[PDB]
DNA sequence: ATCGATGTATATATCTGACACGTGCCTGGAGACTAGGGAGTAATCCCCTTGGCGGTTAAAACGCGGGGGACAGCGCGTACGTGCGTTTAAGCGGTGCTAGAGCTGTCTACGACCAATTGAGCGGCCTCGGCACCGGGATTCTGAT
DNA sequence: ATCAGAATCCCGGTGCCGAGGCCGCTCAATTGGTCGTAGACAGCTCTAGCACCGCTTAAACGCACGTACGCGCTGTCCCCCGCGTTTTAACCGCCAAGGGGATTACTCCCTAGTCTCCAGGCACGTGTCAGATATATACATCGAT
């Protein structure tokens, strides 16, 4: 299958819960589109780096170490999955 | 017995600040990751732990962004966060 | 047979393994004798500090098992380690319970 | 597949001999140790490269520790490192 | 006659944005640098180019900080920049 | 020995710095905060430069030491060597 | 006869190969790695100098000064992204005034 | 003898702009920029070779590092320029 | 003040799976000997950093008037939070199968190393033209009318 | 719209000093040969990722409604700007000194490399107890009066 419209899968209550963890008390209605766009950009960057690492490794499965190295490359170091 | 519009929101703020669990349902996030990765290379495969790490990083980044948005909304003597607040927060963080 | 280099230095972390990692990590053409001992001592001190703060955090929460939440509390509560690990994300760590003053009632 | 895990357990029991530690926390501790080791080693290698030296000794590691670690942590780590090096030199 | 209280400020803004010279007098900055270095090691000496590099870095950092302060002031529907604006600009940039 | 040299950064200099940054109007309390920010940033950079100098067993701070310290701080300076 | 002429480049292939051997990057180094690296460096230098020359021409000058490099880098989005954290000595800042400060 | 790229940056400038000059401070800036990019690419390729348990830096590692470091248009053009140079070099060096 | 709703904390019991201990093995770390070269140390030189004097002028400090911008108060209306019934898909558990990660074996191309050659690149010297400084007219732009 | 004055732009002249070119030299890149080894490729295993079905139920969703907050407007007053006057110290140049940074030469001891061995640490296995869940419950807090 080819995917098309799964960015709407990040529902409004999910954004509301993420904002509640961040301390936001009251939310305006245009925030959701901006948050989805920010999510799209960040995931595209990280997925580009991880896919580049995988293609260099001659593999076809994105190993968690590839994602960890991709996060480390941009300075968003992540602990708990190796490396 | 309707509560005033502050008090339930603060209860949720306390609940999710004492919690640790992932806030985004897993399958839609997996589908979004697949859709995004489809462009760079076809017929890819993903380990489950890789998607878990992706989701952890996304949730942490979005929580930090929302904290900064809240701070810059408080700066304007407001409580509601608007799109301009997110734009300013990203502009000051040094994101594009 | 004879004593491990950690016992000679009086440390718990493996001096020899750190020496092998320094040799194989492509850092320099030569490696001094005291460099692995010094690095092992520093790593042991940092690990001991993190575990002390995590154990204190776990005792505060009345728990007897250190979990990532206690690591996040220990790191984000201490200013030195927060400067050291300011760009580090901890899986399953949560966030500090901080609420803005203006959002409080009254 | 080597990891710091057993050594962390020994240090934990040496410090608080009544608390366990979850597997996720073990992975986090191992990753933190590896990250600090990598930072210190890279800084020491660059430092030795600037001065046209071809060996990593105690002095470059001390200077790298002073560089990465914040002031209180740097002072305490330096003190412990010099104590361990002195003990090893006396014992050899 | 007098210009209105906007106009001379705008002229200065254009003039100093068009030029590339250093804005801080060299001897005061030199003395400040030597005082600050006095706390870490006594009887230190400085090459002129080292102090010039320090001065260039300070100019760039302060200029960027004032730009961010101007944006976060304009966010609050203000022209004038207050201490709280600089505090917010430094807090969002991860310097506090 | 030295006394109070953070006043050497006079008010007109901070005004000119804000003019390059595009600031049109400045409150009277900005200057002390700017001086504090300057004192902390210069403290960090000078600490790292003096550390690099002390490693080489030198007594003079060279431009290369400052450039290396700045590169370590994540802000890279071009045109002064290295 | 030189490796740069053989590859059709002006940058020194041999010097880059020596620097890669002395930099402690790997125990062995392939033959085409220095050629690839010098080609990439030559392309980047050509792009930066072309933009700087255009900026200097727009200023009616024939010499390239740090101001021209600064303008060329900040006026190109990709190079600005590549050199976001880099500060250029004697470069100045982009002419940019917020519309809110402009008069009636 | 102190080495730098300054005498090569001038040849490229005279090739792309036959009549434009350039000061000494711009030489220092361009030399610093070339050295910085060289060190970034080399360090990234070294880490890349270390991840895959290899001990050789080849054109593959340098190409992947270029793809990682440069923004998309620059990465594509640099990859094209590097692969063209490498294919021209291997075309000639035995024939 | 106050009590009812209500979510949240607290105390206890079953389980369960996840953590704490034992075992066998094998491979990575320790002792020993060798060479050799890298680093420590000592002398030298010169250049480049520090210190002082003087003037002078441009920049900083100070006083003062005022205007315009920050800020507090008020009204309003609308956008967002809360609750409830519905529906939708996320989650979990089992089962399938096959693609592909991972390990091992083999061998040949390829890169380290070493000695001889020489020509490309760097340091130094010289000069002239681009740019900067000065000066003066032209044009723009701002504010009061 | 107008007009005067202040600021800027432009145009030309003179100078000056730094960029461009030329030449000697030296040491670093090239070439040719040898030898070890590493990684490219084939092949085998067996793990786990993907796809699906079914049931359940909790989360999402749509809508109704009320009200708290963002935003626009108005008045006020205070405090920052802009300009004239006074002061001061930054800067340039010039000279003197000395000290320390870079260089070279000598030495010696410290580390890579190889070998031999053996014990510690790490998969596999196991068992048992702290915490998760469930349930009951207590308690403090929000809200309406």
Q: Please, where are the H alpha helices in F22-75? A: 30-55, 63-72
CATH architecture of G3-101: Orthogonal Bundle (1.10)
For chain B, say whether E93 makes contact (Cβ under 8 Å): yes
User: What CA–CA distance (Å, rounded) separates F46 from F69?
Assistant: 8
Q: Name the pairing type of β-strands A26-27 and G63-64.
A: unpaired
Query: Experimental method for this entry?
Result: cryo-EM
| Measured distance CA(H44)–CA(H61) in Å, rounded | 9
Resolution of the structure, angstroms:
3.5
Pick from D74, B18, F52, B96: which is nearest to B10 by CA? B18
CA of E8 to C1' of J84 (A): 17
| Fold classified for B6-93 | Histone, subunit A (1.10.20)
Residues 6+ apart with CB under 8 A from D91: C8, C9
Q: How far apart are CA F10 and CA E88, in angstroms?
A: 24
CATH code assigned to D4-91: 1.10.20.10
Contact C29 G24 (CB under 8 A): yes
* Rg (alpha carbons) of chain F, rounded to whole number: 16
Q: In chain G, what are the domain boundaries?
A: 3-101
User: Is there contact between G23 and strand I, defined as CB under 7 Å from any strand atom?
Assistant: no
Contacts for F45-49 with beta carbons within 8 Å, 24 or more apart?
A: F45/E54, F45/E57, F45/F69, F45/F70, F45/F73, F46/E33, F46/E36, F46/E37, F46/E40, F46/E54, F47/E40, F48/D67, F48/F72, F48/F73, F49/E50
Nearest residue to E58 (alpha-carbon basis) of D49, C14, F66: F66
User: Do β-strands H56-57 and G28-29 pair in parallel, antiparallel, or remain unpaired?
Assistant: parallel
CATH topology classification for F5-72: Histone, subunit A (1.10.20)
Chain-chain contact of D27 with A80 (C-beta, under 8 angstroms): yes
Separation between the CA of A60 and the C1’ of J45 (whole angstroms): 19
**Residues of C with Cβ-Cβ distance to A78 under 8 angstroms:** 88-89, 91
Strands B45-46, B80-81: pairing is unpaired
* Nearest chain G Cα distance for residue H29, angstroms: 8
Considering only CA atoms, which of D47, B50, D40 is closest in space to residue A57? B50
Residues in a beta bridge with D21: C66
Nearest CA to H65 out of H54, H78, H56, H55 is that of H78
Beta-ladder partners of A61 = B45
Which residue from F13, F2, F7, F5 is spatially nearest to F32, judged by alpha carbons? F7
Would you kindly state where each structural domain of chain A is located, as residue ranges? 9-73
Q: What whole-number distance in Å separates Cα of residue E86 and Cα of residue H91?
A: 60
3-state secondary structure of C77: helix
Q: Cβ(G68)–Cβ(G56) under 8 Å?
A: yes
Q: What is the DSSP letter of H19?
A: T
Q: Which fold would CATH assign to domain A9-73? A: Histone, subunit A (1.10.20)
Residues of chain B with C-beta less than 8 angstroms from the C-beta of E84: 75
Q: How far is the CA of B88 from the C1' of I10 (A)?
A: 45
- Give domain H5-93's CATH architecture: Orthogonal Bundle (1.10)
Closest residue by Cα to residue E93 from E66, E74, E75: E66
In terms of CA atoms, which chain C residue is nearest residue G25? C26
Name the closest residue (CA) to the C1' of nucleotide J112: C30
Q: Where are the domains of chain E?
A: 6-93
Nucleic acid strand J within 7 Å of B80 CB: yes
Q: What is the DSSP letter of B3?
A: P
* Domain C5-103 of CATH type 3.30.420.310: no
């Amino acid at each position: 299958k080819i995917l098309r419209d799964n960015i709407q899968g990040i529902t409004k209550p999910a954004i509301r819960r993420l904002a509640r963890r961040g301390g936001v008390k009251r939310i305006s209605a245009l925030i959701y589109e901006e948050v989805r766009a920010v999510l799209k950009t960040f995931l595209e960057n990280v997925i580009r780096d991880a896919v580049t690492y995988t293609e260099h490794a001659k593999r076809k499965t994105v190993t968690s170490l590839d994602v960890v190295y991709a996060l480390k490359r941009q300075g968003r170091t992540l602990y708990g999955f190796g490396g | 017995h309707r509560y005033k519009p502050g008090t339930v929101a603060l209860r949720e703020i306390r609940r999710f600040q004492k919690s640790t669990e992932l806030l985004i349902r897993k399958l839609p996030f997996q589908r979004l990751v697949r859709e995004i990765a489809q462009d760079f290379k076809t017929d890819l495969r993903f380990q489950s732990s890789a998607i878990g790490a992706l989701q952890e990083s996304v949730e942490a980044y979005l929580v930090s962004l929302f904290e900064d948005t809240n701070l810059c909304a408080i700066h304007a003597k407001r409580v509601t966060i608007q799109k301009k607040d997110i734009l300013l927060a990203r502009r000051l963080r040094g994101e594009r | 047979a004879s004593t491990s280099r950690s016992s000679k230095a009086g440390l718990t972390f493996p001096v020899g393994r750190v020496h092998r990692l320094l040799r194989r990590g492509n850092y320099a053409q030569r490696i001094g004798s005291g460099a692995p001992v010094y690095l092992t001592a520093v790593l042991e001190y940092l690990a001991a500090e993190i575990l002390e703060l995590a154990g204190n955090a776990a005792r505060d929460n009345k728990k007897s098992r250190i979990i990532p939440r206690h690591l996040q509390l220990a790191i984000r509560n201490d200013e030195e380690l927060n400067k050291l690990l300011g760009h580090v994300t901890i899986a399953q760590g949560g966030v500090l319970p901080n609420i803005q003053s203006e959002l409080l009632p009254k | 597949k080597e990891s710091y895990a057993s050594y962390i357990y020994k240090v934990l029991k040496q410090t608080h001999p009544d608390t366990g530690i979850s597997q996720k926390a073990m992975s986090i501790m191992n990753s933190f140790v590896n990250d600090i080791f990598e930072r210190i080693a890279s800084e020491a290698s660059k430092l030795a490269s600037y001065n046209k030296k071809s060996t990593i000794s105690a002095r470059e590691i001390q200077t790298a520790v002073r560089l990465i670690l914040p002031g209180e942590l740097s002072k305490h780590a330096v003190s412990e490192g010099t104590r361990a090096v002195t003990k090893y030199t006396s014992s050899t």
